[PDB]
């Protein structure tokens, strides 16, 4: 999984 | 609207203690309280309202992703037949999924979007909108699949210009609508060097554009900053 | 009831999925389900019953004593007076945590504690009625305090009596239900003397009974003896 | 607070 925006 | 007899104020008060007490589902209920009052949102009730649905469709995706693997198993070859539990039980996860996502989408539709002129509120709410059509195309399997996709594509797009015309490119709402971009070329439009460039991009021209900004917004930008990094390590 | 048309299996079946899925709330509604089924519970379904609905109020638990931090703080000279909200969300987040309860004790009340006759059964219910007496003893403000404490004591008495007599020093019901008396001693009771002089009698029986053990049951017993020397050098 | 059991 990629980080999204926390 | 169980909310409709509490007052705006109050509602949002009571987001603020309920993210205090990491109780997110009443968070998203008074956020969602709140934006059906009918009037604008200011920038900390924009965070409110996305940091509480964030975190209710978080778990949901998280638990989602569990079953879908342990139902993904249960189809191999030489795998013990359990009966419908546990694809009943992953459809009633992902419906709920859906649920919040139709909500928040319902949110932006009546009538975030239309009365939000400026870029950082305009940007915000249609970054909102392609990430929870992302979401669903997570899950999505039938012959909609190919629209919900086209959906999140087009708000981002859209998302993207504004922000480009609009924002400087240490904007952290610009970072954060780029990285989130970027992460559905590639997990689900299989676009990978898509990805792979619009986060390259998106980095170089914000470090070119650090000089201009005070210690505080420098921390706020290069924090996202670090996350289109992280990607990028793990995709090249 | 919702779970009425489900089958007893399945309804174990998805509670471990939920489980896995770190779905506690529906874990606790399968579990649910299963006992009004009206038959008893194997060992390996009364921990799911216990963990579902301990993660459920556990993090109730953790955000009443947020809250109720934060009212406290309300009511400090020189604190601004800020209006009903925060006692507002405590109450709302104190009655579904009593609801909680409330619904644990009726699940044992009917009719899980009267079918019990073996002493694993009988102490591991008597254990978690005493348990969510003790709960709602950690909320409690009014005319019934004194009623609901002496309802979790007497029923932690009943379990002690029985777990003494038909039970081992190193058994892990026995010992986590003394761990709890003892905490119930300790945080409810103002009886820091009980608690610990309870911990320590349990602990050194428990010891001299290790040797009795094979591999497997002695790391049962000594990581909740373990739990009886956390609190030993906490509280002395 | 005191640890109860796990
Ligand atoms: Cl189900
Ligand atoms: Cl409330
Ligand atoms: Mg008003
Ligand atoms: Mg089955
Ligand atoms: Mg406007
Ligand atoms: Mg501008
Ligand atoms: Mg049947
Ligand atoms: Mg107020
Ligand atoms: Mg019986
Ligand atoms: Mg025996």
Same mark, same amino acid.
């Given at each position: 999984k990629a980080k999204s925006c926390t | 609207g169980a909310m409709g007899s509490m007052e705006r104020a109050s509602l949002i008060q009571k987001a603020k203690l309920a993210e205090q007490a990491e109780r997110y589902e009443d968070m998203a209920a008074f956020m969602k309280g709140a934006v059906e009052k009918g009037e604008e949102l200011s920038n900390e009730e924009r965070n409110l309202l996305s940091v509480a649905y964030k975190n209710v469709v978080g778990g949901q995706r998280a638990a989602w992703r569990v079953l879908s693997s342990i139902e993904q198993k249960s189809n191999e070859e030489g795998s013990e037949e359990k009966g419908p539990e546990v694809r009943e039980y992953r459809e009633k996860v992902e419906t709920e999924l859906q649920g919040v996502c139709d909500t928040v989408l319902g949110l932006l539709d009546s009538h975030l979007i239309k009365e939000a002129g400026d870029a950082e509120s305009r940007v915000f709410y249609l970054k909102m909108k392609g990430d929870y059509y992302r979401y669903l195309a997570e899950v999505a399997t039938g012959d909609d699949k190919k629209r919900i996709i086209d959906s999140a594509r087009s708000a981002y797009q859209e998302a993207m210009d504004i922000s480009k015309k609009?924002? #400087? #490119? %240490?904007?952290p709402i610009r970072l954060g609508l780029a990285l989130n971009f970027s992460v559905f070329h590639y997990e689900?439009?299989?676009?990978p060097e898509e990805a792979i460039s619009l986060a390259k991009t998106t980095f170089d021209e914000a470090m070119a554009d650090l000089? %201009?900004?005070s210690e505080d917004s420098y921390k706020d930008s290069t924090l996202i900053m670090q996350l289109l990094r992280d990607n990028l390590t793990l995709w090249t």
């Open positions: - | 609009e924002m #400087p #490119p %240490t904007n689900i439009a299989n676009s000089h %201009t900004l």
